[PDB]
C-alpha cells in the first residue's frame, strides 16, 4: 500500500485543531535575528522547515521511505547507495556523540575557560566585557597560519612602537556597561 | 534569495535518524551498538524471501569479462589442464612490450 | 572555500568543511571557537547545548555521551 512518515517512529503533532478553534500557523518570515528587514520564507526555507534539507529528495520521507514493495507485502532489497546513506546518517550521529563527549571530558578535566571566546576574539570584538583578575612541517604551517591570522591590524608605531616592545593599555574612560549600545 | 536565514540544525535533520538507529536498545538500560562502520563493508543485495529472487541484469564490471586463461597457480595445482603451448606463460611480473 | 586563501581553506579543512553546502558537528572547545572565528565569513553556526542534543536525539537523561562514545567502535 502507501506509506507516509515524517518521523522515524511515525508519530507527529496533531495535524488538525479541535473543531471550531483557531489553528496554529508557522512563522512566515525568515528566521533573521534583526527585526528588519522582514522577508517571507522562500521555498527552500519552507523545505528546511518541513524537514527536507534544502532540495527535495534529501533527508526527507521522499528518500527514507521505500520506493516500492511487492503486492504480497514483501519489501525490497538493500541497495549499495541505501547502505551508504545509512552509513552517512550513522556518521552524523557519531560526529554529534563524539563532539558531545569531547565537551564533557573537557569540562571534567577543567579545560573549558570561564571567559567566552578566544584572545583574538576578545582583542577584536569590543562587545565582549573585560575580564580582569614524525614530521614538523605541519606544525610550522599551523604556527605560520596563526601568526598570519592572529592580529589582522597592528597598533600604529606612532602610538606604541612594537619593535621596542611598547604596547598600549585599554582606555575604558568612555566605555558603557549596557550592551544596548552595540545591540541597537 | 540565496542568503537564507534558517537554523542550520535543519540542514541535517535528525527526525529520521534518532539514537535508536545506533543503539536499538537505548530506551532500555542496554547499550548494544549496531552501526554501519563504513560503505566498504557492504556484502551485497540479499533476497528477503525465496519467492522473490533478485533479477539477473548484468553490470558493466560483471559482464565485460573475457574468458579465463589458466594461470601459474591453476597449472601448478592441476597439471592436466596444461594442454597447449600458450599455457606456458612467462613470469607474471612481465607486463609486456613498451 | 577554494575562492579564498589557503589559510582559510586549512581552517575549514580542520573544521572538516571541504565544499560549499557541507555540514559538520564540532565541540565548543577554544580551538574550534578560534577556527570558527577565523572563518566566520564563510560558515553559518548553530549552537545546541548538551541537554538540547540529548533531547534532539533519542537518548535518556541518565545516559551521558562519554559512555556512548566508548561504546561506538
Amino acid at each position: 500500500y502507501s506509506e507516509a512518515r515524517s518521523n522515524y517512529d511515525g508519530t507527529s503533532l496533531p495535524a488538525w485543531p479541535a473543531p471550531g478553534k483557531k489553528p496554529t500557523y508557522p512563522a512566515a518570515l525568515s528566521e533573521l535575528r534583526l527585526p528588519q528587514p522582514r522577508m517571507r520564507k522562500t521555498r527552500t526555507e519552507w523545505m528546511y522547515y518541513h524537514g527536507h534539507g534544502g532540495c527535495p529528495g534529501k533527508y526527507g520521507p521522499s528518500r527514507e521511505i521505500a520506493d516500492f514493495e511487492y503486492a504480497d507485502g514483501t519489501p525490497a532489497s538493500i541497495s549499495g547507495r541505501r547502505f551508504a546513506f545509512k552509513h552517512h546518517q550513522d556518521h552524523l550521529l557519531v560526529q554529534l556523540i563524539r563532539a558531545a563527549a569531547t565537551v564533557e571530558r573537557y569540562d571534567a578535566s577543567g579545560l573549558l575557560p570561564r571567559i567566552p571566546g578566544t584572545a583574538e576574539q576578545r582583542n577584536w570584538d569590543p562587545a565582549i566585557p573585560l575580564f580582569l583578575d614524525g614530521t614538523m612541517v605541519s606544525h610550522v604551517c599551523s604556527r605560520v597560519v596563526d601568526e598570519r591570522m592572529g592580529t589582522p591590524t597592528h597598533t600604529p608605531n606612532e602610538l606604541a612602537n612594537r619593535h621596542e616592545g611598547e604596547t598600549l593599555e585599554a582606555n575604558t574612560m568612555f566605555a558603557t556597561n549596557d550592551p544596548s549600545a552595540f545591540v541597537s | 534569495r540565496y542568503r537564507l536565514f534558517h537554523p542550520r540544525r535543519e540542514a541535517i535533520p535528525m527526525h529520521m535518524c534518532p539514537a535508536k538507529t545506533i543503539f536499538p536498545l537505548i530506551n532500555s538500560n542496554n547499550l548494544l551498538v549496531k552501526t554501519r562502520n563504513s560503505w566498504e563493508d557492504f556484502t551485497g543485495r540479499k533476497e528477503f524471501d525465496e519467492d522473490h529472487p533478485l533479477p539477473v541484469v548484468g553490470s558493466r564490471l560483471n559482464g565485460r569479462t573475457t574468458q579465463h586463461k589458466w594461470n601459474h597457480w591453476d597449472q601448478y595445482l592441476n597439471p592436466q589442464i596444461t594442454q597447449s603451448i600458450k599455457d606456458l606463460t612467462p613470469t607474471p611480473e612481465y607486463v609486456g612490450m613498451r | 572555500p577554494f575562492k579564498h586563501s589557503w589559510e582559510v581553506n586549512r581552517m575549514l579543512r580542520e573544521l572538516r568543511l571541504e565544499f560549499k553546502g557541507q555540514t559538520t558537528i564540532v565541540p565548543d572547545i577554544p580551538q574550534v571557537r578560534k577556527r570558527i572565528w577565523r572563518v566566520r565569513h564563510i560558515v553559518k553556526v548553530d549552537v545546541l547545548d548538551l541537554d538540547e542534543a540529548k533531547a534532539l536525539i533519542g537518548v535518556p537523561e541518565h545516559i551521558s555521551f562519554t559512555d556512548l562514545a566508548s561504546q561506538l567502535p
Binding site: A84, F85 | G44, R45, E47, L54, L61 | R16, E18, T24
Partner: peptide, 29 residues
C-alpha cells in the same frame, strides 16, 4: 587530495557484493 567523507558518498561497486546463492539440499536425500 584526501577525502573527508563529510557529504553523502555513494558506495563503490566491488565484486564482493555479488549475490551469492544458497546451498540447497538435493531433492533425493
Amino acid at each position: 587530495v584526501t577525502r573527508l567523507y563529510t557529504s553523502y558518498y555513494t558506495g563503490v561497486l566491488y565484486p564482493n557484493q555479488l549475490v551469492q546463492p544458497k546451498q540447497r539440499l538435493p531433492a533425493d536425500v
